[PDB]
C-alpha cells in the first residue's frame, strides 16, 4: 500500500480559495472540505510570503464575521501541520499549488511529529468523492 510522495498527488485534494469561497455557504461544507488540504499563507519572512501545507481537520467559528471575497463569513478552518493545529480564516488560503519544497517540508514535519502520511488511495477516493458530489 502506497503513501503520498509527490506534490502532484497531494494537489489533487488541495482546495483553492476560490472553491472555499464558492462553497462556504453550502449545507455540507464541513463534510466536503474535511480531509482536504490547503496551501496556507502563515506570514512573511523578510517581507516575503511564506506558505505551508496543512490538512483541514474541521470547520469552526471565528470571533468576528469577516470579509471573504464578496461575502461575509464567520467560518474558520481547523488546520493541521504535523502536530501544529491552528485555526485560520479562509482569506489566507492560497489559489496557487504546492511547491515541491513546501511538500518536502511538510513530509519532514510529519515524520518528526510521528504522524502517518495519507495513502494515495485515500487521496484518490477523497478527490473522487468531491468530483462526484459536484
Amino acid at each position: 500500500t502506497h503513501m503520498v510522495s509527490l506534490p502532484e498527488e497531494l494537489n489533487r485534494v488541495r482546495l483553492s480559495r476560490h472553491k472555499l469561497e464558492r462553497w462556504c455557504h453550502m449545507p455540507f461544507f464541513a463534510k466536503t472540505v474535511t480531509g482536504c488540504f490547503v496551501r496556507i499563507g502563515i506570514g512573511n519572512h523578510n517581507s516575503k510570503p511564506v506558505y505551508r501545507v496543512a490538512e483541514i481537520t474541521g470547520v469552526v467559528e471565528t470571533a468576528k464575521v469577516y470579509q471573504l471575497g464578496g461575502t461575509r463569513t464567520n467560518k474558520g478552518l481547523q488546520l493541521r501541520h504535523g502536530n501544529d493545529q491552528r485555526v485560520f480564516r479562509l482569506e489566507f488560503v492560497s489559489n496557487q499549488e504546492f511547491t515541491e519544497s513546501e511538500f518536502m517540508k511538510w513530509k519532514e514535519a510529519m515524520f518528526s511529529a510521528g504522524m502517518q502520511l495519507p495513502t494515495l488511495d485515500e487521496i484518490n477516493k477523497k478527490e473522487l468523492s468531491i468530483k462526484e458530489a459536484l
Binding site: 496556507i40 499563507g41 506570514g43 512573511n44 482569506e91 489566507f92 488560503v93 492560497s94
Partner: peptide
Amino acid sequence: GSRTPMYG
C-alpha cells in the same frame, strides 16, 4: 491573480 494576504 489576486494577492493572497498573509496571516498576521
